[PDB]
Coordinates of C-alpha atoms in Angstrom, one line a residue:
Chain A
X215 CA -1.4 -28.5 35.8
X216 CA -3.8 -27.3 33.7
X217 CA -1.6 -28.5 30.4
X218 CA 0.3 -25.6 28.9
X219 CA 3.7 -24.2 27.3
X220 CA 4.5 -20.8 27.1
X221 CA 3.5 -20.8 23.7
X222 CA 0.1 -21.1 24.1
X223 CA 0.6 -18.2 26.7
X224 CA 2.4 -15.8 24.1
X225 CA -0.3 -16.9 21.2
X226 CA -2.9 -16.2 23.6
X227 CA -2.2 -12.8 25.1
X228 CA -1.4 -12.0 21.4
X229 CA -4.3 -12.6 19.6
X230 CA -6.5 -11.9 22.6
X231 CA -5.3 -8.5 23.5
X232 CA -5.2 -6.1 20.4
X233 CA -6.8 -3.4 18.3
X234 CA -8.2 -4.1 15.3
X235 CA -7.9 -2.9 11.8
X236 CA -12.3 -2.2 12.0
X237 CA -13.7 -0.1 9.5
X238 CA -16.5 2.2 8.8
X239 CA -20.5 2.0 8.9
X240 CA -21.6 3.9 5.9
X241 CA -18.1 3.0 4.4
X242 CA -16.5 4.6 1.8
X243 CA -18.0 4.3 -0.8
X244 CA -21.5 4.5 0.0
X245 CA -24.6 4.0 -1.9
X246 CA -27.2 7.1 -3.2
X247 CA -29.0 8.4 -0.2
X248 CA -27.0 7.0 2.3
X249 CA -27.5 9.0 5.5
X250 CA -25.2 8.2 8.2
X251 CA -21.5 7.8 8.8
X252 CA -19.9 6.5 12.4
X253 CA -17.0 4.5 13.2
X254 CA -16.5 0.5 14.0
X255 CA -14.7 0.2 16.9
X256 CA -13.9 -3.6 17.0
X257 CA -11.8 -5.5 19.4
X258 CA -9.4 -3.2 21.6
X259 CA -6.2 -3.0 23.3
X260 CA -6.0 -3.3 27.3
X261 CA -5.8 -1.1 30.2
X262 CA -5.4 -3.3 33.5
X263 CA -4.1 -6.1 35.2
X264 CA -8.0 -7.7 35.7
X265 CA -8.0 -7.6 31.6
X266 CA -5.1 -9.5 32.0
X267 CA -6.1 -12.1 34.2
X268 CA -9.2 -12.6 32.8
Chain B
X269 CA -8.9 -16.8 -9.7
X270 CA -9.7 -20.4 -8.1
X271 CA -10.9 -20.3 -4.7
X272 CA -12.1 -23.8 -4.3
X273 CA -12.3 -27.2 -6.0
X274 CA -16.2 -29.0 -6.9
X275 CA -17.3 -32.2 -5.7
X276 CA -18.2 -32.9 -9.7
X277 CA -15.5 -30.2 -10.6
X278 CA -17.6 -27.3 -12.1
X279 CA -15.3 -25.2 -9.7
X280 CA -15.7 -22.0 -7.7
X281 CA -13.9 -18.8 -9.3
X282 CA -13.3 -15.3 -7.6
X283 CA -15.6 -14.3 -10.6
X284 CA -18.4 -15.5 -9.3
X285 CA -17.7 -15.1 -5.4
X286 CA -17.2 -11.0 -6.0
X287 CA -17.5 -8.7 -8.6
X288 CA -14.3 -7.3 -10.0
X289 CA -13.1 -3.9 -11.4
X290 CA -9.7 -1.5 -12.0
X291 CA -11.1 1.1 -9.2
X292 CA -9.7 3.8 -7.4
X293 CA -7.2 3.2 -4.5
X294 CA -9.4 5.3 -2.4
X295 CA -13.1 6.6 -2.6
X296 CA -12.9 9.2 0.2
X297 CA -12.5 12.5 -1.6
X298 CA -13.9 13.5 -4.7
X299 CA -12.8 16.0 -7.4
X300 CA -15.3 18.3 -9.2
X301 CA -14.3 21.1 -11.4
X302 CA -17.1 23.4 -12.0
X303 CA -19.2 19.9 -11.1
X304 CA -17.4 18.0 -14.0
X305 CA -15.5 15.5 -13.0
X306 CA -11.4 16.3 -12.6
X307 CA -8.1 15.3 -11.0
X308 CA -5.7 17.9 -10.5
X309 CA -2.0 18.5 -9.6
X310 CA -0.5 20.3 -7.0
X311 CA 2.8 22.0 -8.3
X312 CA 5.3 23.3 -6.0
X313 CA 8.3 25.8 -7.4
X314 CA 11.9 25.0 -7.2
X315 CA 14.3 25.8 -4.4
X316 CA 15.8 28.9 -6.0
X317 CA 13.8 28.7 -9.3
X318 CA 12.0 31.0 -11.3
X319 CA 8.3 31.3 -11.0
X320 CA 7.5 33.0 -14.2
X321 CA 9.5 30.6 -16.4
Chain C
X55 CA 44.5 16.1 -11.7
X56 CA 42.2 18.6 -9.4
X57 CA 39.4 17.0 -8.0
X58 CA 37.3 17.5 -11.5
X59 CA 34.7 15.2 -12.3
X60 CA 30.7 16.4 -11.6
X61 CA 29.8 14.2 -8.3
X62 CA 27.2 11.6 -8.7
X63 CA 25.2 9.2 -6.5
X64 CA 23.8 5.6 -7.7
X65 CA 21.1 3.5 -6.1
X66 CA 21.2 -0.4 -6.2
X67 CA 18.2 -2.8 -5.7
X68 CA 18.1 -6.9 -5.9
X69 CA 14.7 -8.6 -7.0
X70 CA 15.6 -11.9 -8.0
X71 CA 14.8 -13.8 -11.0
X72 CA 12.4 -10.7 -12.3
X73 CA 13.1 -10.3 -16.0
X74 CA 14.5 -6.9 -17.4
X75 CA 11.1 -5.5 -18.3
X76 CA 10.3 -6.3 -14.4
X77 CA 13.0 -4.6 -12.8
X78 CA 12.3 -1.6 -15.2
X79 CA 8.7 -1.5 -13.9
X80 CA 8.9 -2.7 -10.2
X81 CA 12.3 -0.9 -9.0
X82 CA 13.6 1.9 -11.9
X83 CA 10.5 3.9 -12.8
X84 CA 9.7 4.3 -9.1
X85 CA 12.7 6.1 -8.0
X86 CA 12.8 8.9 -11.2
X87 CA 9.3 9.6 -10.1
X88 CA 10.6 11.2 -6.9
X89 CA 14.0 12.4 -8.7
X90 CA 11.9 15.3 -9.6
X91 CA 13.9 18.4 -8.5
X92 CA 17.2 17.6 -6.8
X93 CA 19.5 20.3 -6.6
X94 CA 22.2 20.7 -9.1
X95 CA 21.3 17.6 -10.8
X96 CA 23.0 17.4 -14.4
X97 CA 21.5 14.2 -15.5
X98 CA 20.1 10.8 -14.4
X99 CA 21.0 7.1 -15.7
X100 CA 19.0 4.0 -15.1
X101 CA 20.0 0.5 -14.8
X102 CA 17.0 -2.5 -15.3
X103 CA 18.7 -5.9 -14.7
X104 CA 17.5 -9.2 -15.6
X105 CA 19.4 -10.7 -12.5
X106 CA 17.4 -8.5 -10.4
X107 CA 20.0 -6.0 -9.8

């Protein structure tokens, strides 16, 4: 109906659902005086069936 | 390293878009022997070898 | 004869078209840095071939 092959289901759930090679605030090597270091948590892997319906 | 061809022709090289240097593969840990820059070697003895030799 | 000759192990890898000195740096010298401290090793011998092997 809504004009689709499994292939778009594949690429969909793949690139939609994943962890991500994020990086860091205050990234190393920082600059003279830098006074924050903390973790970038970007796009995360899933958990539920909701997160999969959506 | 070429990144793109220009409309007139003065192309855009990586040279231009970013800075380039021979650099550490990792800048997390820094080694200061007596405050002076240093780099060390961690040597382990063989498997049934003499220490003092 | 009795089994007489000192036992030995060879490693072989393929890197097609790569020139001799390339295989000398891309495969041969990579191994000899981790052949540091094997037990009862008499000697070591490396072949860096320009057919990539």
